[PDB]
């Protein structure tokens, strides 16, 4: 008896990451992606709008962006394949700092993965707006 | 004894997953220029015995 | 819902647990919670104003459903039939 599905929708929002606390922001992104105020609001499949983040490179942390925030990454058979970098150390690819803090606050299943697909970050600003030809409702954080 | 041995019967499935490569390749028969019967390119036509002329007896 | 419907609608045949009053046409009368008679979005009590009337359509024996249980190691296996009874009624109230 409960409601069914739709589709012909793909709200194309553009959140700004500037100065905002990565995490907070993240949660937000992770929100809409999966399902915000949701349409049919349903599991089975995703209807959670498409997210575009600009800047990123200017996200924000606090006491540690040198200390503590160490994005680890362990490659091949761990024959000492213990590779880690300070977050500030992610000045080579801020892009991932976000992108790779959100794919966390998102289901980890089959669908879950297919959901990073809709998240789409850009380390810049206006130039980013180029990889942007559809809608662009700028729903900043709070 | 028979030292190494299998840890289970393999699915009739998996046992097939394998075999997806034993499929023969059908010869590339070609039509003789004379007997017009099909021959194997580069060899003598088993039917007429030709190869531009007739080599093998009838 | 928890027996004896409610809400708006347009008058359909729906299945809800037995209604005692057998036979048919037993003009059934239900309170009302919410409803929009003419879009008139009406909420509780202020809704009590209006009401619903339905007519017992038919009584039914639901679709069979075997209730099974099983706890392992301790043997224990329970197969038991079942199927609930219901009363279909035709909506048609104010």
């Amino acid at each position: 008896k409960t409601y069914i599905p739709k589709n012909d929708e793909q709200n194309w929002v553009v959140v700004d990451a500037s100065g905002v606390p990565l995490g907070r922001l993240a949660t937000l992104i992770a929100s809409r992606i999966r399902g915000k105020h949701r349409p049919d609001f349903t599991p089975n499949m995703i209807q959670g709008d498409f997210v575009v983040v600009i800047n990123a490179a200017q996200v924000a942390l606090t006491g540690k962006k040198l200390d503590d925030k160490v994005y680890t990454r362990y490659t091949g058979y761990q024959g000492g394949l213990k590779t880690e970098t300070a977050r500030e150390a992610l000045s080579k690819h801020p892009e991932r700092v976000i992108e790779h803090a959100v794919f966390g606050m998102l289901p980890k299943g089959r669908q879950g993965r297919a959901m990073h697909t809709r998240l789409k970050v850009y380390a810049g600003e206006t130039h980013p707006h180029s990889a942007q030809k559809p809608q662009v409702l700028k729903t900043q954080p709070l | 004894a028979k030292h190494p041995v299998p840890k289970k019967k393999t699915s009739k499935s998996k046992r097939d997953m394998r075999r997806s490569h034993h499929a023969l390749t059908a010869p590339n028969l070609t039509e003789c220029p004379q007997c017009h019967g099909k021959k194997l390119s580069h060899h003598i036509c088993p039917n007429c015995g030709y190869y531009d002329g007739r080599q093998v007896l009838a | 819902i928890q027996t004896g419907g409610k809400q708006y609608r347009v008058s359909e045949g729906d299945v809800i647990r037995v209604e005692s009053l057998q036979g048919e046409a037993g003009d059934k009368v239900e309170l009302k919670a919410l409803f929009v008679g003419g879009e008139q979005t009406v909420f509780g009590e202020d809704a009590g104003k209006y009401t619903v009337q339905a007519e017992v359509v038919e009584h039914g024996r639901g679709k069979k459903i075997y209730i099974r249980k099983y706890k392992s190691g301790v043997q224990y296996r329970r197969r038991t039939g079942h199927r609930q009874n219901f009363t279909a009624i035709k909506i048609l109230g104010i």
Binding site: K1, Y3, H37, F41 | - | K6, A33, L34, V36, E39
Partner: protein
């Protein structure tokens, strides 16, 4: 006198085999395993009714506030509110009214706020 088990066992089985369908390999073609698959099956069958009840109600709530927050409230708040108005008592369906009838939901929403602060 001799009393076989003829035709009595075949039946017994096919009864089970047959319960098995979209049961992958052996779990559907061979008795023994077929049947065995069907104990855990019990475990699930049962504990699943008592359960889908929890689940669904979870889909209901999730919407009831992804609509509530759609005006400025939140299930939490939006709900104690209707509760405030003993007048309101749907809970069941309420969500649907959130999913299809935006007009209404609006009403109830604000209806609560004015039974709140």
């Amino acid at each position: 006198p001799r009393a076989k088990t003829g035709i009595v066992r075949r039946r017994r089985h096919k009864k089970v085999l047959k319960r098995a369908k979209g049961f992958w390999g052996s779990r559907s073609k061979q008795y023994r395993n077929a049947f065995q698959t069907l104990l855990n099956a019990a475990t699930y069958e049962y504990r699943d009714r008592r359960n889908k009840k929890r689940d669904f109600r979870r889909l209901w709530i999730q919407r009831i506030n992804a609509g509530a927050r759609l005006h400025g409230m939140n299930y939490s708040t939006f709900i104690n509110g209707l509760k405030r108005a003993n007048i309101d008592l749907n809970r069941k369906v309420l969500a649907d009214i959130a999913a299809r009838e935006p007009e209404a939901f609006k009403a109830l929403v604000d209806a609560s706020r004015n039974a709140r602060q």
